[PDB]
């Protein structure tokens, strides 16, 4: 009521506040045994030394992932996942160079000229024939693929 606000918290309220909340048992920081290099970081799955941060940290866990993906997965099922180039092997022009480096390396030998038809007057491609029916390829699924 009269403006006497304490510049400092009085010594009394220091003790009264500082005694309402308990000491964390861990901040005691006592250790005369040392560190347990073999066991400490490998403790039970409940309170385990839990890695965190960048994926590098999950050493003991990535191993379990591999052991896990190894477990449930039959290789039979995984065979069906195709890479892009595995699929592009069936395209009329599967692989031709792009202009940055090896543009000159491309040649008419790379052209699937038999697929379409050319007209001599226009010098262009007037149309294209059907490729689904007559494409007889011994590897519709690739060779090493064995369902």
């Amino acid at each position: 009521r009269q403006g006497y606000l304490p510049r400092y918290t009085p010594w009394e309220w220091i003790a009264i506040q500082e005694a309402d909340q308990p000491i964390i048992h861990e901040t005691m920081r006592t250790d005369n045994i040392g560190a347990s290099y073999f066991f400490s970081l490998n403790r039970s799955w409940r309170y385990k030394a839990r890695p965190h941060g960048y994926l590098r940290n999950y050493e003991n866990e990535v191993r379990d992932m591999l052991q896990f993906v190894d477990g449930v997965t039959p290789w039979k099922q995984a065979q069906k996942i195709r890479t892009y180039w595995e699929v592009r092997q069936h395209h009329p022009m599967p692989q031709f160079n792009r202009p940055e480096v090896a543009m000159h390396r491309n040649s008419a030998g790379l052209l699937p000229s038999h697929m379409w038809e050319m007209d001599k007057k226009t010098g262009k491609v007037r149309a294209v024939k059907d490729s689904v029916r007559d494409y007889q390829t011994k590897i519709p699924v690739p060779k090493w693929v064995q369902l």
């Binding site: 010594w11 009394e12 220091i14 003790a15 500082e18």
Partner: peptide, 24 residues
């Protein structure tokens, strides 16, 4: 080590040089 250290509540530990508050 009490909560209120002996520096405060004591005659012999009085800081004679410590000027009072309404002076400065």
């Amino acid at each position: 080590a009490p909560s209120i250290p002996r520096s405060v509540w004591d005659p012999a530990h009085y800081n004679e040089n410590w000027v009072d508050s309404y002076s400065t």
